Design an enzyme around this catalytic site. Sequence first.
Site, PDB file in Angstrom:
ATOM      1  N   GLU D  49       0.823  -1.220  -0.077  1.00 25.70           N
ATOM      2  CA  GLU D  49       0.078  -0.107   0.117  1.00 25.70           C
ATOM      3  C   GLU D  49       0.911   1.379   0.044  1.00 25.70           C
ATOM      4  O   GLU D  49       1.620   1.263   0.916  1.00 25.70           O
ATOM      5  CB  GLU D  49      -1.027  -0.045   1.229  1.00 25.70           C
ATOM      6  CG  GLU D  49      -2.156   0.728   0.875  1.00 25.70           C
ATOM      7  CD  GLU D  49      -3.109   0.184  -0.025  1.00 25.70           C
ATOM      8  OE1 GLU D  49      -3.221  -1.027  -0.322  1.00 25.70           O
ATOM      9  OE2 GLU D  49      -3.854   1.033  -0.567  1.00 25.70           O
ATOM     10  N   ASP D  60      -5.055  10.173   8.379  1.00 26.82           N
ATOM     11  CA  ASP D  60      -3.883   9.830   9.098  1.00 26.82           C
ATOM     12  C   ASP D  60      -3.550  10.368  10.496  1.00 26.82           C
ATOM     13  O   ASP D  60      -3.580  11.669  10.536  1.00 26.82           O
ATOM     14  CB  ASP D  60      -2.786  10.069   7.919  1.00 26.82           C
ATOM     15  CG  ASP D  60      -2.946   8.893   6.893  1.00 26.82           C
ATOM     16  OD1 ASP D  60      -2.683   7.687   7.252  1.00 26.82           O
ATOM     17  OD2 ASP D  60      -3.209   9.327   5.711  1.00 26.82           O
ATOM     18  N   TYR D 175     -11.229  -3.661   2.637  1.00 28.01           N
ATOM     19  CA  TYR D 175     -10.367  -2.989   3.734  1.00 28.01           C
ATOM     20  C   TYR D 175     -11.336  -3.138   5.042  1.00 28.01           C
ATOM     21  O   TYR D 175     -12.181  -2.489   4.977  1.00 28.01           O
ATOM     22  CB  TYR D 175     -10.047  -1.724   3.405  1.00 28.01           C
ATOM     23  CG  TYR D 175      -8.656  -1.063   4.346  1.00 28.01           C
ATOM     24  CD1 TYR D 175      -9.028  -0.770   5.910  1.00 28.01           C
ATOM     25  CD2 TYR D 175      -7.614  -0.854   3.892  1.00 28.01           C
ATOM     26  CE1 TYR D 175      -8.064  -0.324   6.592  1.00 28.01           C
ATOM     27  CE2 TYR D 175      -6.680  -0.411   4.482  1.00 28.01           C
ATOM     28  CZ  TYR D 175      -6.839  -0.348   5.917  1.00 28.01           C
ATOM     29  OH  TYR D 175      -5.808   0.302   6.627  1.00 28.01           O
TER      30      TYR D 175
HETATM   31  O1  LIG Z   1      -1.070   0.726  10.563  1.00 22.28           O
HETATM   32  P1  LIG Z   1      -1.811   1.991  10.761  1.00 22.28           P
HETATM   33  O2  LIG Z   1      -2.617   2.243  11.784  1.00 22.28           O
HETATM   34  O3  LIG Z   1      -0.900   3.196  10.168  1.00 22.28           O
HETATM   35  O4  LIG Z   1      -2.935   2.019   9.382  1.00 22.28           O
HETATM   36  C1  LIG Z   1      -2.175   1.968   8.154  1.00 22.28           C
HETATM   37  C2  LIG Z   1      -3.214   2.331   7.128  1.00 22.28           C
HETATM   38  N1  LIG Z   1      -2.653   2.974   5.741  1.00 22.28           N
HETATM   39  S1  LIG Z   1      -3.456   2.528   4.603  1.00 22.28           S
HETATM   40  O5  LIG Z   1      -3.079   2.914   3.351  1.00 22.28           O
HETATM   41  O6  LIG Z   1      -3.856   1.064   4.489  1.00 22.28           O
HETATM   42  C3  LIG Z   1      -4.906   3.379   4.849  1.00 22.28           C
HETATM   43  C4  LIG Z   1      -6.308   2.871   4.639  1.00 22.28           C
HETATM   44  C5  LIG Z   1      -7.468   3.813   4.918  1.00 22.28           C
HETATM   45  C6  LIG Z   1      -7.405   5.015   5.445  1.00 22.28           C
HETATM   46  O7  LIG Z   1      -8.266   5.702   5.911  1.00 22.28           O
HETATM   47  C7  LIG Z   1      -9.673   5.578   5.484  1.00 22.28           C
HETATM   48  F1  LIG Z   1      -9.965   4.492   6.227  1.00 22.28           F
HETATM   49  F2  LIG Z   1     -10.466   6.477   5.957  1.00 22.28           F
HETATM   50  F3  LIG Z   1      -9.886   5.116   4.210  1.00 22.28           F
HETATM   51  C8  LIG Z   1      -5.923   5.486   5.596  1.00 22.28           C
HETATM   52  C9  LIG Z   1      -4.810   4.537   5.275  1.00 22.28           C
END
Ligand SMILES: O=P(O)(O)OCCNS(=O)(=O)c1ccc(OC(F)(F)F)cc1
EC number: 4.2.1.20
Lengths: 395, 395, 268, 268
Positions: D49, D60, D175
């Site tokens: 990703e 984030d 997801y």
């Molecule tokens: O391990 P962590 O807690 O840093 O999470 C990593 C996530 N990175 S990601 O690209 O999958 C990712 C996936 C979804 C996100 O937001 C949403 F749900 F609103 F769409 C933000 C980042």
Amino acid sequence: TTLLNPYFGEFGGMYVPQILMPALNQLEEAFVSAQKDPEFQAQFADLLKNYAGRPTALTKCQNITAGTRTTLYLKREDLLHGGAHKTNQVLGQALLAKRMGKSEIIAETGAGAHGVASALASALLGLKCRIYMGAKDVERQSPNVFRMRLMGAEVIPVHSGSATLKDACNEALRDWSGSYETAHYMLGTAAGPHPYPTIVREFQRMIGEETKAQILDKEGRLPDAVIACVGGGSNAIGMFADFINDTSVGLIGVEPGGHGIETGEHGAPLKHGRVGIYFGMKAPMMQTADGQIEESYSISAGLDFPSVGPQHAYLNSIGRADYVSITDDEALEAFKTLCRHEGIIPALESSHALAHALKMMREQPEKEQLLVVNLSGRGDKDIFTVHDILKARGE
Amino acid sequence: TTLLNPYFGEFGGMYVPQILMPALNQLEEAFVSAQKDPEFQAQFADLLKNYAGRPTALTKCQNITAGTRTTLYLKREDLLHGGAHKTNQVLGQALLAKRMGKSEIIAETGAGAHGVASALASALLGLKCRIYMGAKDVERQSPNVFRMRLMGAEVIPVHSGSATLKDACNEALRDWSGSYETAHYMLGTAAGPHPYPTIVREFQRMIGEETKAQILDKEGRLPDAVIACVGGGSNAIGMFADFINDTSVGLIGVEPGGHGIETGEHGAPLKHGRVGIYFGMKAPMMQTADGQIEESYSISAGLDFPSVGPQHAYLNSIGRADYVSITDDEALEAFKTLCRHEGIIPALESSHALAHALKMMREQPEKEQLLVVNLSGRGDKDIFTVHDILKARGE
Amino acid sequence: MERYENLFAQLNDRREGAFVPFVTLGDPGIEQSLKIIDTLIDAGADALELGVPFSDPLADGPTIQNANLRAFAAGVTPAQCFEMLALIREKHPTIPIGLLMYANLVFNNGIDAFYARCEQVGVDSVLVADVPVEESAPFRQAALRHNIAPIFICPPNADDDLLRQVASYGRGYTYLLSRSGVTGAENRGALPLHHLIEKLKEYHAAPALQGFGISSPEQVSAAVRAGAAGAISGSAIVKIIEKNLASPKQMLAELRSFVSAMKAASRA
Amino acid sequence: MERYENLFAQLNDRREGAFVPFVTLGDPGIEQSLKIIDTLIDAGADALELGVPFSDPLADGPTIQNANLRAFAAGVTPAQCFEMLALIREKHPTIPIGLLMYANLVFNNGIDAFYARCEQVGVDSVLVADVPVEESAPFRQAALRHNIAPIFICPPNADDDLLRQVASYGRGYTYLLSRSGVTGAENRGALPLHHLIEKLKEYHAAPALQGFGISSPEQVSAAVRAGAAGAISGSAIVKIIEKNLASPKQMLAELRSFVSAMKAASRA
Ligand SMILES: O=P(O)(O)OCCNS(=O)(=O)c1ccc(OC(F)(F)F)cc1
Ligand SMILES: O=P(O)(O)OCCNS(=O)(=O)c1ccc(OC(F)(F)F)cc1
Ligand SMILES: *Cc1c(COP(=O)(O)O)cnc(C)c1O
Ligand SMILES: *Cc1c(COP(=O)(O)O)cnc(C)c1O
Ligand SMILES: [Cl-]
Ligand SMILES: [Cl-]
Ligand SMILES: [Cs+]
Ligand SMILES: [Cs+]
Ligand SMILES: [Cs+]
Ligand SMILES: [Cs+]
Ligand SMILES: [Cs+]
Ligand SMILES: [Cs+]
Ligand SMILES: [Cs+]
Ligand SMILES: [Cs+]
């Protein structure tokens, strides 16, 4: 001779040089005439409503009285254009200057509130305005000085005497002694020579009139007491006037206790000064043992007038009104309390009135009492003063 | 699905992470319910009248239009408690938070006006308030930060991104993404995801409603145009809403031109930006060529929102409203003019609206036109900025 | 008051106007002020007007405002001024001594007691600058009980009623104001006063002394020619003090020269 | 999208979960980011990703906010990120590459053109973090026209309608959000997800990857045991970058150690 009594009992009078007597007589005549003139009253009402914002709210403050038998309303003069009650009477006096054919205004100011009020009224009504201010006040009130200059007024620093408010009061009278044919002296409180204590009361009395109507509407009865801070006396007499004949209604005036009455560092001549003759009137004043005029000390720069209006001294002497004092620290706790629990930042002047109402409540929390505090102005101007105290205190 | 249309034509929508959708749906339901609830409407009207001071004056300004065929009124949102129109809608949103059973408030702020508005409403209604503010805004707005802290609010500096308003907008959404079961996000303008542009308009629409009533009373007809400055769009949509169906009434929104549109240093995305998707909405925005969000520049810190509400973009696209810009120098001449000739110190935000009305007048001084400017706030906060410019200029 | 009656009778026999300087007591210090006052007398002053330093002298322009400030810088109090006055009278038997007071200093420890102290030290008149005729009753009554002349101001636009009041109530001399405004040599009066002078005589007023803005010999002679009994000069005298603070001997020399010139103007 | 279909089929044959790291493209610079990504792959990443630096990453937490800021400090642009993506695909034929986008970067020069560029460089999926299912139509349509899987978020409280929408519209993987709030290793999800996992399978959804707060081997194994096809870890990976900025070799060593451990947790 005069049309109206220049005294309230033994207080008041017209202690000006002979040369100024025709100016006071002219002003008294113009006032008495204006009060009977429905065109004058309509023009004044129009300015008060559409320019200044009257009527002002009467706010019930629930959070600060929770769990007591006190009901507390605040008369919101803080919402008036300019942020203080001073605006009411400067609009009336500017109309009086026009009525007399004058196109120039002279004003005194200490901390600058009345200077700004005079300058705004003059700008609106097309009058050329000059404002005297003690050089020490000029140096410490740059924001208000700049406001007066933005509004087209001339600000003239005064270096004589103690270079503060009383010295600006003298300078305004000196100027008027030569210029009264073309200039009006727009005195800033309910004090000085007759007819000013009477004029200023009548041009502030809408405070109490509105309060009476608003409290009849909301509570179906008159207040147990109305409470106002006392610098020179204008906001307090404005709140009191319409209640004087309602003998069940307490009238409580709050003078600044400064560091404490016992320290001598205060601004409470009505209760802790000595009657003298100064600024055109016989009234209680801050003075030395041999009769030199002294400064009024308070955390609040707006409570710096070193005497008090003669109608207050009279209402006290007959027992119609009661006068108390509130110290810097009590005022500053009331300021913090209103900010935190009502979201209203009060002027430190007004905070003295609120501090006294809070004491009435806290001392006797099971006493059923309906109180109105005159919230004479907003406290944006005071946040640096308060910040600096709290920091130096380690809060 | 939603109860109301989240779009104004192609502008608006709900561009938030999935996790926040139930929060927006909950808020929309609570709003639609509240709008039908006469207990809610009465509580809101009570706060607006007795706490905030509504109705606000409509002032006819004679000196500034003398010798032209323009009649100019100022709707005096500067007189509202807090000194700006922001107070209206924060009171409504605080009531919505209570309606939903929430006792915590989250808010964003740039220059601090909305932070102070959120903090006062929260203090009044007993809500725990936390306010996000870009660290660079914190450093330059000490007075407003201290006001929020006096009112019991927590102010949380934001150090991410550009450390300004857009970054505080993100931080408020981040917090709400986890806390929405107990906290309400009290968004500060008529922008962001549905239902906020609709809620903020409806909780500001008393501006235009009162203006319509006041101008029917004083002039016996509707205005030729109503004119308002446009940061995010709340004061302008509040003035416009009740006139949208009165097709003879011009609706003029004034964006900040900053140093001049051609310099790129401005805050006028509606007319000089590019449609994008940010802060929950599809709307014109300040952005780089490759889609990074940029700052809005203006002499007036309150015009820093880097986009504009979607209803404005829509009203523009259909030609119902017209949008113009006013530069720093035009705004600063309008500020000086109102101080000197009307005794009213306007917010520099509001001065952009006044500068445009002054241009309408001066350009065509024999055109008969009845204009209302929404005077969205007072300018006490701006006197240092103005002082410093005038000094550096040698005035 | 009798000292004025005797002075004016003697001056009338000498076909002479009075020249009357004003100074602030204790400016620039007690000892120098005493020497100043003896110099004014030796140089030809017919009478004196003497100010007690007051915090708020609202009928005075900057020159005299600054004289008050100098006396305060030297720690001068009203009690010290009364000690000075007793000494001045002990040196000079016949010269009329008038005080220029503000109301609070008279009222402070009792109006009657104030005038009793004036009589004890040998003062002849009191002018209270911020008490107009309308407020004058307890002041003029106390003055007369203690053989002190109450001095009334006649403004240049006085109507008949005011002239009659000032004529009836006053003793010693009538203060004939040159102009509106406050004390100062920078502003000369431009209004003809001879009509007022004539009406005051018609009403048997105390003899008139013209005051405010008198700074030159020609003004002293003009006052006499208009029918006044003499002229008062304050700011011009105090200016000499202010100019010469660094040199007490030059100060006295210049004071003597000025007073001599001004007095010479009253004879002719 | 086919790369995910093939990966999940192969993993199902190996009785293995997927381990999928997230990093920001160009953090801490383009060259180091390329080496980071090759290390993640060599150490066992099943898919990637990859975030394009954006000024306003509102889903984030601070760890990834700071990764965006580092990439901006290095002057990283979306154009440079697409050059990076083309190079990554040119090196690695089968690994699924997913982007984490914010809506404005997708919409900026046209949604269709964005997905066309993704297809040109060999990207397999796109997750637009601030586009909920309600606003997804033009994004998911453009994705599918260009053989890109649109990635949908299933929140831990998804009702039946939302599950059915995400199941119908999504491709590649679903997801599975661990919790409310924003990305970050400092907050671990505490809600059981196996009911959601089961309903997604019932509705023939794309295989689920659990993400948000995954920072430890035991969480990877827990995701697999609950029935998910694997787990995504972002902040924990980015933390290693942030800790080791001063030593690129130690950074790669620690990244390798972490990814190896996390991948090992998916087998068993
Ligand atoms: O391990 P962590 O807690 O840093 O999470 C990593 C996530 N990175 S990601 O690209 O999958 C990712 C996936 C979804 C996100 O937001 C949403 F749900 F609103 F769409 C933000 C980042
Ligand atoms: O020569 P100038 O212009 O300084 O005038 C000198 C006057 N000094 S004085 O004591 O006679 C004197 C007389 C009257 C005064 O005020 C009053 F008229 F209001 F009563 C003030 C001072
Ligand atoms: C000037 C002022 C006062 C005191 O003056 P008063 O004449 O006694 O009313 C009190 N409150 C405020 C806010 C003021 O501006
Ligand atoms: C906040 C503010 C604005 C701009 O915000 P809008 O949402 O566009 O109204 C304008 N004027 C004043 C005084 C403000 O405080
Ligand atoms: Cl009535
Ligand atoms: Cl109606
Ligand atoms: Cs009396
Ligand atoms: Cs109560
Ligand atoms: Cs006082
Ligand atoms: Cs649409
Ligand atoms: Cs006009
Ligand atoms: Cs803007
Ligand atoms: Cs007489
Ligand atoms: Cs599917």
